[PDB]
Design a protein around this ligand. Structure first.
Ligand SMILES: O=C(O)C(=O)C[C@]1(C(=O)O)C=C[C@@H](O)C=C1
Lengths: 91, 90
């Protein structure tokens, strides 16, 4: 019975705090990578596709390849732009 | 490189968790779809409330632009998923 809307939405909220915090940490790592490389462009397509491949093989209730592809397309965009901007300003 | 290999191992650990968290967030949205079958999926007030709330938190790098991008896609994923899950009921 604790599945009322209030409670499910608090659970979403806890998810979103963690998801946000993890995304923040993923940008800090991407910052470190940008700095040790400083490539003209940051785009490493082989690596992106390796990430997706590996994650696709894992066991999920609801995620599949379409959902991961959409999710990570945005994640990789966010990460790429962030690294670019970091390199523009620190130079 | 060497440093590079380690940073990428960390990304990998991160991405395992980020995926696991997204899968759990789909499960909860599934529960929500099911307790709310007589109503629209798109709740723009709630989406805005989520972003506002998350914008208030302390981040090293995230800002409003980055969260908006991220969650636009998260909400799209969540919306489509709920639709399709409800299509599998009678
Ligand atoms: O909280 C809800 O009402 C949901 O259905 C979940 C969610 C979300 O992904 O957070 C999904 C679709 C709506 O646009 C608003 C919120």
């Amino acid at each position: 019975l604790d599945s009322l809307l209030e409670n499910l939405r608090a659970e979403i909220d806890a998810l979103d705090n963690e998801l946000s915090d993890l995304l923040d940490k993923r940008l800090e790592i991407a910052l470190k990578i940008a700095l040790i490389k400083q490539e003209s462009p940051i785009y490493c397509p082989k690596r992106e596709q390796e990430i997706l491949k590996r994650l696709s093989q894992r066991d999920f209730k609801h995620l599949n390849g379409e959902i991961l592809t959409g999710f990570y397309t945005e994640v990789f965009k966010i990460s790429r732009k962030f690294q670019e901007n970091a390199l523009k300003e620190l130079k």
